[PDB]
Backbone:
């Protein structure tokens, strides 16, 4: 569910796994960079969708008045 | 803190002129201007005005604050230049955004 | 809902006044032969403009019949110091002299510093920027400030991002 | 009446039969050529039919767009 | 020569009908000859205003759909 | 956008997680998450593309009414 | 595309002949005193209904002036077996054959098997489900199959998904 | 493969009748005849009169079971549900299709 995916933004199990592995001495910054992109994408993509929501709501409100 | 964290959300007049001119990147006198950017002095409204035109802007723009109420944060120069019909789109949208709460 | 006839008549009346009879609504009041108190409550929106007054207004405006009911939008589509003075003058209409905290208050000649300007403005529960606003407020965006402050930050960004896009599409 | 006709219900009412459509049809009877006048009313009424349909059509698509965005959000 | 109604099919023609159609011309002088055409005159007022108004909403939506698709572009391009 | 779509099918983390699974360490929690995040990229992109089609249709109809 | 006047005129011409003259172009050809071919060309759309015909049509159709020019869209609201041969018969019309299997004439007042119809149909080249229904309202055959076939699968889903959505918003 | 993704880079009449009827469960058909309700195996060729009653029972009609829905140029939609639509909504479906056709050259 999307509620789950939004919660994957901050401190996922993948996040908790990747951090302790970096402390051991092997460079996981390549992998760590990838999770950053996706997690930011979740945030950003969800920000845009809600922005569209408001604007379609607005468009539908103007249409309602002219037709009803 | 690398990721966005956006979903989880979360003063004097001379300090604003410091920020808003720093935000604005004859030209009368250089040292006069070199002081203003770090505050340290209070400028006159007549000198405030002629300085503003240098960028294409007006006087009040540089000393206008942005607290919670007046933080509708936009370029006034750009807005003033808009045609009326299109200014109507902005105020119609804003006033709709209000109604979506209560 | 958006644009009723009263609102149309009101806009056309203000247009006539701004276009033809220029500054004062007293000058239309003379030509229409009606109280300037009545002419003022039509313009500002207090009293709506009925059927008979509409034509009377038209008859007085030298336009043709129902022009006032017709929306004409489709065609439609200074010193800082004296301002700070004239604002402070117009603010003295609505504390009264003497105020406190400052003297040397000259209005006409001087170009006050913004700090004092602010102390004068803030004493009226206002801000300095308001004192030095141009003739006509073109960049302003009139709105209720309490309500914008009350909006969630997510709803502020939606408002602000839209305006910028609007700017971009106009330049 | 004047408010009625200014409601969308009222402007739609003008499509089929309005006093103006009654009025114009009488003038034609007497030999006055209302080709110019009548061709405009028809256009005005046809724009009312046409734009109302488009709006209803856009109404359908926006609720589709809103339907999908819910599922991605919800 | 070229026809009359071919221009009036276009929205450029319908918008031009807003102020001073031949129908507007027609009803006004008819009023000046003593018959009450306020009813008819009012009907044309509603339609012409609707043209103005509906055209205004559509451009408004034009702007908002451009906005929506500008934001969509970024996320998918 | 191209980069995040590329993560869908071939990513270092998906290789990484598939190497850790062989050891005996159960990565069902971490692996289930990646799949979802990845599936959200396919899903959200198809919807956005879908919305792109309908806004362009809506824009088309308005142009005909306005032009 | 948005309607030209010919579209509305013809659409109105079509509806008149149905609702007044029984959807037969000859009966209206008889009243209007014009060739049934010209009438057929107007109905089919092969010829644009002129301004003058439209008036003559209105006279002939007993309609008030310019009614034909007006869009009235907002105005308010058999056997399988014999049609299998009626289709086949109309499809014969382009001998008793029947080049592949068959030798059923066919009378078509008896129920045949879907295999025989399938074997019959591909003789003409057409499918077996055609033309099973007289109303044709149940299906969009308007679209060219080649154009739909050529669409990337991704574009098909959009088409089918919007259809399914329209279905649920009605009933 | 618990990873749902729609992109990497960038037959005869009796079997269709059996398939379409297999789809109309989830949504005992005798009622009429109980013989036919083994058609699912596609061992028999039902007569059009009986298939019509094996459609008309559902409120669907005969042809809907025998349309080659799997064909690329045949849209998969419920034909009975499209019949009941007002012309206004029929037009909306037709209007979007032709738009989508004009896109993609």
Residues:
């Amino acid at each position: 569910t999307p509620v789950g995916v939004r919660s994957l933004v901050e401190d996922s199990h993948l996040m908790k796994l990747l951090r302790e592995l970096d402390k051991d001495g092997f460079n996981v910054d390549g992998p760590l960079a990838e999770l950053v992109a996706l997690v930011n994408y979740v945030t950003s993509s969800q920000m845009t969708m809600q922005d569209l929501q408001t604007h379609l709501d607005y468009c539908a409100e103007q249409l309602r008045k002219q037709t009803t | 803190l690398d990721v966005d964290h956006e979903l989880d959300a979360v003063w004097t007049v001379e300090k604003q002129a410091a920020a808003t001119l720093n935000a604005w990147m004859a030209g009368i006198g250089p040292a006069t201007v070199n002081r203003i950017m770090k505050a340290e002095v209070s400028t006159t409204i007549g000198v405030l005005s002629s300085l503003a035109r240098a960028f294409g802007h007006e006087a009040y723009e540089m000393i206008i604050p942005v607290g919670a109420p007046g933080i509708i944060d936009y370029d006034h120069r750009m807005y003033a230049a808009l045609p009326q019909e299109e200014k109507n789109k902005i105020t119609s949208f804003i006033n709709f955004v209000f109604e979506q709460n209560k």
